Amino acid sequence: VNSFSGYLKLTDNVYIKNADIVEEAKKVKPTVVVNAANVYLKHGGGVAGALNKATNNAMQVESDDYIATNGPLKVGGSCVLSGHNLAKHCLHVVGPNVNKGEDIQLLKSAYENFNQHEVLLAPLLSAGIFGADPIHSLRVCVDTVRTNVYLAVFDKNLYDKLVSSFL
State the residues that interact with ligand A1CJC by CB under 6 A: 20-22, 36, 46-47, 50, 123-124, 127-129, 152-155, 158
CB of 44 to ligand A1CJC, least distance (A): 12
- Other CB atoms within a 10 A radius of the CB of residue 105 amount to 10
CB of 65 to ligand A1CJC, least distance (A): 24
Per the CB < 8 A criterion, the answer to whether 16 and 153 are in contact is yes
CB of 150 to ligand A1CJC, least distance (A): 11
What amino acid occupies position 130?
F
CB of 123 to ligand A1CJC, least distance (A): 4
Q: Is 162 exposed, middle or buried (0-12, 13-18, 19+ CB in 10 A)?
A: buried
Angstrom distances, CA of residue 55 to CA of 36, 59, 94, 124: 15, 6, 20, 21
Q: Which CB atom, from 20 or from 64, has the smaller least distance to ligand A1CJC? A: 20
DSSP 80: E
How far apart are alpha carbons 39 and 77 in whole angstroms? Answer: 8
Q: Which CB atom, from 37 or from 127, has the smaller least distance to ligand A1CJC? A: 127
Question: Does an H or E element contain 143, and which?
Answer: helix 134-144
Question: Does an H or E element contain 153, and which?
Answer: strand 148-153
Q: Which CB atom, from 28 or from 152, has the smaller least distance to ligand A1CJC? A: 152
In the bound state, the residue with its beta carbon closest to ligand A1CJC is 128
Q: Which CB atom, from 64 or from 155, has the smaller least distance to ligand A1CJC? A: 155
CB of 105 to ligand A1CJC, least distance (A): 18
Q: Which CB atom, from 15 or from 154, has the smaller least distance to ligand A1CJC? A: 154
